[PDB]
């Protein structure tokens, strides 16, 4: 009962290549607040800022 033919040999499966996706988002920029005038002249307000 030993077969004369030799058995066929299986081919192993292909492994999966794990891949990541890196995307970026776009947040909208902020606008300016309102111009509020003050009492001070230029150099004092400049140094303060």
């Amino acid at each position: 009962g030993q077969p004369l033919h030799l058995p066929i040999y299986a081919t192993p499966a292909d492994p999966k290549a794990l891949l990541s996706a890196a995307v970026a988002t776009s947040q909208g920029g902020g606008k300016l607040p309102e111009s509020f005038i003050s009492l001070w002249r230029f150099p004092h307000m400049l140094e303060n800022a």
């Binding site: 995307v23 970026a24 988002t25 776009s26 920029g29």
Partner: protein, 49 residues
């Protein structure tokens, strides 16, 4: 794409306040191109432009 739009926004805010006869346009845009295209040098960003 939002990423290329982020490039547009960064270069837009970056090279805002520019005059042509003050300096070269290419040398002005070269750092943002060197960063967004992840280039190491600035002469390379000059070269590719």
């Amino acid at each position: 794409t939002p990423e290329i739009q982020n490039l547009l926004d960064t270069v837009y805010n970056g090279l805002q306040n520019f005059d042509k006869n003050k300096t070269k346009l290419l040398a002005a845009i070269a750092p943002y191109i060197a960063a967004t295209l992840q280039l190491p040098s600035e002469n390379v960003a000059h070269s590719i432009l």
